[PDB]
């Protein structure tokens, strides 16, 4: 399943946390913007990755939002600008 | 319909703060700023067409990007928020 992961990381140690989040996502998705990831995971993998993401961020100052994009999500996404 | 707008604005170039401010202002009446640079827009198709044009015009596509996700209805996306709510 496709889960869109949007990471709003604070601007102290934030750069490291974004690096760690990107690394944790590397095998299971694509980093489509600086802090946005299109994650393709089955439910068990998502349980695992989600836990890691929760542990890697600082929930006091960062946030994560997760969106289930559904099937045929590729026809429902438009990119404008730099890649 | 819900459209999720993700704005990746350059930090290495000047005016990014202003461009993000203008994008947020354009999204203010039809949506919610759910993260620093992410907006949930609740729009009919004509409103979306109009807003999309403004957002495209407001960014610098050489150094910024926008991604627009058509979510259908918000409930279909089973959205979860973890962490801070500034």
Author numbering:
A (entry chain B): 1 to 11, 14 to 85
B (entry chain A): 1 to 86
Manuscript excerpt for this entry:
Cas2 is a universal Cas protein found in all types of CRISPR-Cas systems, and plays a role in new spacer acquisition during the adaptation stage of CRISPR-Cas immunity. In this study, we describe the structural and functional characterization of Xanthomonas albilineans Cas2 (XaCas2) of a subtype I-C CRISPR-Cas system and provide experimental evidence of pH-dependent conformational switching involving a hinge-bending motion during activation of the dsDNA nuclease function. Overall, the structural features of XaCas2 were similar to those of other subtype I-C Cas2 structures, including the protomer fold, the dimer interface, and the conformational state. The XaCas2 protomer contained an N-terminal ferredoxin fold consisting of a four-stranded antiparallel β-sheet (β1–4) and two α-helices (α1, α2), and a C-terminal segment including a 310-helix (η1) and a β-strand (β5) [Fig. 1(a)]. Although activity was observed under neutral and basic conditions, no dsDNA cleavage was detected at pH 6.0, consistent with the suggestion that the XaCas2 structure crystallized under acidic conditions was in a catalytically inactive conformation. Together, the functional and structural analyses indicate that XaCas2 is a metal- and pH-dependent non-specific dsDNA nuclease, and support the hypothesis that subtype I-C Cas2 proteins undergo a pH-dependent conformational change to allow metal-binding prior to catalysis.
The crystal structures of XaCas2 were determined to resolutions of 1.65 Å and 1.75 Å at 20 and 4 °C, respectively. Data collection and refinement statistics are summarized in Table I. The root mean square deviation (RMSD) of the Cα atomic positions between the two XaCas2 structures was only 0.07 Å, indicating that the two structures were essentially identical. We hereafter describe only the 20 °C structure, which was determined at a higher resolution. The asymmetric unit contained two XaCas2 protomers forming a single dimer with pseudo-two-fold symmetry, 175 water molecules, and three acetate ions. In our crystal structure, XaCas2 seemed to adopt a catalytically inactive conformational state, as was also true of several other subtype I-C Cas2 structures evaluated previously. In the XaCas2 dimer, the two conserved Asp8 residues were too far apart to allow them to coordinate a single catalytic metal ion together [Fig. 1(c)]. The distance between the side chains of the two Asp8 residues was 11.1 Å, and no metal ion was found near the residues. Strikingly, despite the high similarity in overall structure, the two XaCas2 protomers exhibited significant conformational heterogeneity within the putative hinge regions. Without these residues, the RMSD of the Cα atomic positions between the two XaCas2 protomers was only 0.3 Å, whereas the RMSD value for residues 72–78 was 3.5 Å. In protomer A, Lys74 formed salt bridges with Glu40 and interacted hydrophobically with Met2, whereas Trp75 was largely exposed to the solvent.
